[PDB]
């Protein structure tokens, strides 16, 4: 349900394995392309733990498909994403999301 477009190629031999923390650097846009959240905004990379599902399960699927050292554009369908409810206030209900992800370093 996640559409992947590799802006910069990953190495292909190093991959995020379930049960390993990921340090990514992301930019989130809306359907029409408006940016609501981004790691660029915080200026600090976003750290998340694979397998605890603390973030959207479709997004963990996309990151798992991703290789290390990679720049990509991920379109998440609503059913994997927030869904019909969206994010109250931040993302309008029943809206799909498209994220831009940097993966500089993996620990």
């Amino acid at each position: 349900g996640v559409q992947v477009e590799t802006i910069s190629p990953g190495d292909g031999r190093t991959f995020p394995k379930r049960g390993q923390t990921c340090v990514v650097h992301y930019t989130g846009m809306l359907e029409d392309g408006k940016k609501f959240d981004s790691s660029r905004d915080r200026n600090k990379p976003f750290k998340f733990m694979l397998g605890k599902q603390e973030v959207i399960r479709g997004w963990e699927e996309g990151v798992a498909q991703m290789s290390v050292g990679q720049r990509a554009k991920l379109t998440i369908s609503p059913d994997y994403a927030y869904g019909a409810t969206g994010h109250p206030g931040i993302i309008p209900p029943h809206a799909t999301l498209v994220f831009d992800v940097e993966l500089l370093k993996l620990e």
């Binding site: 408006k34 969206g86 109250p88 206030g89 931040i90 993302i91 309008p92």
Partner: protein, 290 residues
């Protein structure tokens, strides 16, 4: 005048004006309002003490007495021509005194200035509680309700021409400024009035329904603005539909500092916030960004 103790006697009857005393079961009702009767025996406390009233209060009472009758005649005329459209025919009845009504309105607002801010604090406060006192009396005899009746009976007709086919063509040109000045008068009466804002707290749906009307959008919006500022209870009674209606009003009438200030006042009041109202405002307005 102000120190004498006086009995009042009736020439024709020859009996004594007395109080009927608390009759049985009036204690159970709990009403302290008790009837006067006329009997030669009378009661011990039949003597009356007479006390002064201010000339401002006397003038207010006289203008109330005249205004009630005038706008009552206006409402009866409204009812008279409401039933049947006059069409291409004269109303065949006494035309409502449109010019007298006009003059009465600007006379009332001229009675209802807001105090000029340049005035010093003493006279500012003086005219402030004087205006509050006049507003309290005027809502007490309830000419505000009469204004509500006039507003409703005018706004049942959407357009000046639509009013004209029922009432007459000569009123159509006056009709726009008539309704505008009537809303302005209501705003002047209710601004800074606890009783009036409590009345709108009882019945907000009136303003909610007539806000969408174009003919007096500014006046109705200012009315709602004053009610929201002065009354916190209206903010409590507001539900999601009202907030969506205000947002739709901003959409249909375009960007407006007054409307945005109305929303700001709706958000917070008297330093206490309604989280449900804030959440509804957020969810309805912000996520779109358009």
């Amino acid at each position: 005048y102000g120190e004498s103790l006086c009995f009042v006697q009736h020439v024709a009857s020859g009996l004594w004006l007395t109080y009927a005393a608390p009759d049985p079961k009036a204690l159970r009702l709990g009403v302290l309002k008790k009837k006067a009767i006329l009997h030669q025996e009378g009661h011990m406390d039949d003597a009356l003490f007479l006390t002064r009233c201010q000339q401002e209060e006397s003038q207010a009472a006289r203008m109330i007495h005249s205004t009630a009758g005038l706008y009552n005649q206006f409402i009866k005329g409204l009812d008279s021509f409401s039933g049947k459209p006059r069409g291409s025919g004269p109303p065949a009845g006494p035309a409502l005194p449109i010019e007298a009504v006009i003059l009465s309105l600007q006379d009332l607002i001229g009675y209802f200035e807001p105090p000029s801010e340049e005035l010093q604090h003493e006279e500012k406060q003086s005219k402030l509680r004087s205006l509050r006192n006049r507003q309290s009396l005027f809502q007490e005899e309830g000419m505000l309700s009469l204004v509500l009746n006039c507003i409703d009976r005018l706004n049942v007709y959407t357009t000046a021409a639509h009013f004209a086919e029922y009432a007459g063509e000569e009123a159509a040109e006056s009709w726009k400024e008539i309704v505008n000045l009537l809303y302005e008068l209501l705003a002047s009466l209710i601004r800074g009035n606890r009783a009036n804002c409590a009345l709108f707290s009882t019945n907000l749906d009136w303003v909610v329904s007539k806000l969408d009307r174009l003919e007096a959008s500014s006046g109705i919006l200012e009315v709602l603005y004053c009610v929201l500022i002065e009354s916190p209870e209206v903010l409590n009674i507001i539900q999601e539909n009202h907030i969506k209606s205000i947002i739709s009003l901003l959409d249909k009438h375009g960007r407006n500092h007054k409307v945005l200030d109305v929303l700001c006042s709706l958000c917070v009041c008297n330093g206490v916030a309604v989280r449900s109202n804030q959440d509804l405002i957020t969810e309805n307005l912000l996520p779109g960004r358009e």
